[PDB]
Design a protein around this motif. Structure first.
Motif, short mmCIF file in Angstrom:
data_model
loop_
_atom_site.label_atom_id
_atom_site.label_comp_id
_atom_site.label_asym_id
_atom_site.label_seq_id
_atom_site.Cartn_x
_atom_site.Cartn_y
_atom_site.Cartn_z
N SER A 1 6.23 0.99 -5.17
CA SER A 1 7.39 1.80 -4.79
C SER A 1 7.48 3.06 -5.65
O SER A 1 7.92 4.11 -5.16
CB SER A 1 8.69 0.99 -4.89
OG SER A 1 9.08 0.77 -6.24
N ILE A 2 7.09 2.98 -6.92
CA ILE A 2 7.09 4.17 -7.75
C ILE A 2 6.12 5.20 -7.19
O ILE A 2 6.42 6.40 -7.17
CB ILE A 2 6.75 3.83 -9.22
CG1 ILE A 2 7.89 3.07 -9.89
CG2 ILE A 2 6.47 5.12 -9.99
CD1 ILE A 2 7.54 2.53 -11.27
N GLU A 3 4.96 4.74 -6.73
CA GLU A 3 4.01 5.67 -6.12
C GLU A 3 4.59 6.26 -4.83
O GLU A 3 4.38 7.45 -4.55
CB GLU A 3 2.67 4.98 -5.86
CG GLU A 3 1.62 5.91 -5.27
CD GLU A 3 1.37 7.15 -6.12
OE1 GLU A 3 1.67 7.14 -7.33
OE2 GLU A 3 0.86 8.15 -5.57
N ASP B 1 0.86 -1.18 0.00
CA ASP B 1 0.00 0.00 0.00
C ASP B 1 0.90 1.23 0.00
O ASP B 1 1.47 1.56 1.04
CB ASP B 1 -0.92 -0.02 1.22
CG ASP B 1 -1.74 1.25 1.37
OD1 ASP B 1 -1.57 2.21 0.58
OD2 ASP B 1 -2.58 1.28 2.29
N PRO B 2 1.06 1.90 -1.14
CA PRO B 2 2.07 2.98 -1.20
C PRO B 2 1.77 4.12 -0.26
O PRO B 2 2.70 4.78 0.22
CB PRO B 2 2.03 3.43 -2.66
CG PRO B 2 0.69 2.96 -3.18
CD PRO B 2 0.40 1.70 -2.44
N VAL B 3 0.49 4.40 -0.01
CA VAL B 3 0.16 5.47 0.91
C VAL B 3 0.67 5.14 2.31
O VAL B 3 1.32 5.95 2.97
CB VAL B 3 -1.36 5.74 0.91
CG1 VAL B 3 -1.70 6.77 1.98
CG2 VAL B 3 -1.79 6.23 -0.46
N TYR B 4 0.39 3.92 2.77
CA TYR B 4 0.89 3.53 4.08
C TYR B 4 2.41 3.50 4.08
O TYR B 4 3.06 4.02 4.99
CB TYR B 4 0.33 2.18 4.52
CG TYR B 4 0.86 1.86 5.89
CD1 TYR B 4 0.32 2.49 7.02
CD2 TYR B 4 1.95 1.03 6.07
CE1 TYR B 4 0.83 2.24 8.27
CE2 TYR B 4 2.46 0.79 7.33
CZ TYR B 4 1.89 1.40 8.42
OH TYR B 4 2.39 1.18 9.68
N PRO C 1 10.91 17.88 -8.27
CA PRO C 1 10.38 16.67 -8.91
C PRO C 1 8.96 16.32 -8.53
O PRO C 1 8.52 15.21 -8.83
CB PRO C 1 11.37 15.59 -8.43
CG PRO C 1 11.85 16.08 -7.09
CD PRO C 1 11.87 17.59 -7.17
N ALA C 2 8.23 17.21 -7.85
CA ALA C 2 6.84 17.00 -7.46
C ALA C 2 5.92 17.05 -8.68
O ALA C 2 6.26 17.61 -9.73
CB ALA C 2 6.40 18.08 -6.46
N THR C 3 4.74 16.45 -8.55
CA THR C 3 3.74 16.47 -9.61
C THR C 3 2.47 17.21 -9.23
O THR C 3 1.61 17.39 -10.10
CB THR C 3 3.39 15.05 -10.06
OG1 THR C 3 3.05 14.24 -8.93
CG2 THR C 3 4.56 14.41 -10.79
N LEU D 1 6.54 11.05 -1.83
CA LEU D 1 7.60 11.78 -1.13
C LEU D 1 7.99 13.04 -1.89
O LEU D 1 8.20 14.10 -1.27
CB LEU D 1 8.82 10.88 -0.92
CG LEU D 1 8.66 9.65 -0.03
CD1 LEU D 1 10.02 8.96 0.14
CD2 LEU D 1 8.05 9.96 1.35
N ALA D 2 8.11 12.96 -3.22
CA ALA D 2 8.43 14.15 -4.01
C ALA D 2 7.40 15.25 -3.78
O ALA D 2 7.74 16.44 -3.73
CB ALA D 2 8.48 13.81 -5.50
N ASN D 3 6.12 14.86 -3.66
CA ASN D 3 5.06 15.83 -3.42
C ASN D 3 5.12 16.42 -2.01
O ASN D 3 4.55 17.50 -1.78
CB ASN D 3 3.69 15.20 -3.67
CG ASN D 3 3.31 15.24 -5.13
OD1 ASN D 3 3.79 16.08 -5.88
ND2 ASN D 3 2.42 14.35 -5.53
N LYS D 4 5.80 15.77 -1.08
CA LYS D 4 6.01 16.33 0.24
C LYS D 4 7.31 17.12 0.34
O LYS D 4 7.68 17.55 1.43
CB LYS D 4 5.98 15.22 1.30
CG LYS D 4 4.62 14.55 1.43
CD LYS D 4 4.63 13.42 2.44
CE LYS D 4 4.93 13.94 3.84
NZ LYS D 4 3.97 14.99 4.29
N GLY D 5 8.02 17.29 -0.77
CA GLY D 5 9.21 18.10 -0.82
C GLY D 5 10.52 17.33 -0.70
O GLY D 5 11.57 17.96 -0.62
#
Ligand code: NA
Ligand SMILES: [Zn+2]
Length: 403
Positions: free
Chosen positions: A184-186, A103-106, A356-358, A191-195
């Protein structure tokens, strides 16, 4: 000018062995980057770790960079119910890489948990300038990269849904990667979206014989390992590296930000006398010798917080140069000399944001084909443009198309 820059990075501390590694680095003035798992502070990581807090303090007090490797190295995905014995239970099966991401979110949330634990055990940790727990990460098992908007890579064979790479019948399909790899890609993207930036590696200082009873004793010799570094220089090593589960697919070979740089991955538990061999007695001398001959060969050593150079007043920038400023990645619009009152920002004419955030972000040079997330919805960029505050994707029907 130096032959190149080596980034010595250490994974899976803080453990007792970290102190011996740090001391060696300190006697030659060399700084390392440490990708830490806080479960060793809780005493459930199945290593010699009663001095884990001592080792974390020592890393910080002597100027090394501390970065985020997740709370428990994803070991919750190795067992049915995570608990104080999961580390040993997973070491018994060696199934770390099987269903490693689910579960990538977890799983991404265990990087956030990691920081909470660091800040409970060392309440003043964020008063250290070399604490980068919230800004630098590396995924367990995975040679994946999130550096700029145009510098990313994923380890498409890094983890598996069933078979380990050496077992009969194992296959890696780059066009249909495992569920674990897709998760893992997610995680990278969350993480990129959290900076965060995430960094993989060019070379892995590791046992030459995974098969002998004391594998740590087969750690490559300093001279031979310098040969591996020399060969990694400007040769897109993250894609040419072996084994298959260590390759960083999509890595932009020749990208300027990687020029003349070599990121070394190793693990402090390889430098300890114990269950893995006489790593302290045999391998700490290899480490000490490596630092000496690397510097003599013309290399300099640096930490991952400088991999993307930090913006500095008075420096000259060429158009297209990348910097970080207050943790954010920027790309120079024009060649110029930096002045104190004109720093990168969401409104700077001299820089665009190139994180690198989306998620949709201000002052980004968007291109046709880019997809942004905004208020939980995805939008495709219709017309290339530099984003600005009035041009939110939900209302800018000319520039964005809702997907
Ligand atoms: Na950042
Ligand atoms: Zn690891």
């Amino acid at each position: 000018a130096p032959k190149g820059t080596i980034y010595l990075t250490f994974d899976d501390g803080p453990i007792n062995a970290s102190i011996d590694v740090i001391n060696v680095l300190n006697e030659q003035g060399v700084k390392g980057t440490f990708y830490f798992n806080a479960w060793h502070l809780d005493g459930i990581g199945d290593e010699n770790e009663d001095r884990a807090l001592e080792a974390l303090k020592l890393a910080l007090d002597t100027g090394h960079v501390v970065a985020n490797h997740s709370y428990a190295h994803m070991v919750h995905n190795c067992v049915d119910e995570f608990g104080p014995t999961s580390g040993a239970e997973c070491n018994a099966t060696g199934d770390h890489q099987i269903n490693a991401y689910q579960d990538p979110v977890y799983d991404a949330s265990t990087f956030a948990d990691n920081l909470v634990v660091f800040e409970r055990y060392l309440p003043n940790i964020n008063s250290y300038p070399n604490y980068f727990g919230e800004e630098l990460a590396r995924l367990p098992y995975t040679n994946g990269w999130r550096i700029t908007k145009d510098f990313k890579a994923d380890g498409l064979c890094a983890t598996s849904d069933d078979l380990k790479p050496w077992e009969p019948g194992y296959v890696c399909d780059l066009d249909n990667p495992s569920n674990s790899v897709k998760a893992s890609i997610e995680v990278q993207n969350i993480l990129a979206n959290k900076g965060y930036q995430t960094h993989g590696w060019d070379v892995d200082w590791s046992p030459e014989n995974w098969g002998i009873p004391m594998p740590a004793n087969s750690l490559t010799e300093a001279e031979a390992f310098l040969g591996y570094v020399d060969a990694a220089l400007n040769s897109c090593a993250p894609t040419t590296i072996n084994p298959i589960n260590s390759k960083a697919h999509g890595f932009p070979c020749g990208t300027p930000l990687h020029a003349d740089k070599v990121v070394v991955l190793t693990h402090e538990f390889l430098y300890e006398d114990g269950k893995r061999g006489m790593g302290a007695t045999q391998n700490l001398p290899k480490l000490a010798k490596f630092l000496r001959i690397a510097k003599e060969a013309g290399y300099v050593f640096d930490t991952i917080d400088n991999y993307t150079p930090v913006w500095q007043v008075g420096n000259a920038y060429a158009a297209g140069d990348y910097v970080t400023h207050s943790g954010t990645v920027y790309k120079a619009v024009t060649a110029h000399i930096a002045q104190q009152d004109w720093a990168p920002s969401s409104t700077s004419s001299l820089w665009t944001n190139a994180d690198p955030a989306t998620n949709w972000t201000l002052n980004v040079s968007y291109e046709a084909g880019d997809v942004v997330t905004y208020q939980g919805l995805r939008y495709l960029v219709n017309v290339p443009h530099v984003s600005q505050a009035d041009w939110t994707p939900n209302t800018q029907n000319t520039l964005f198309t809702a997907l």
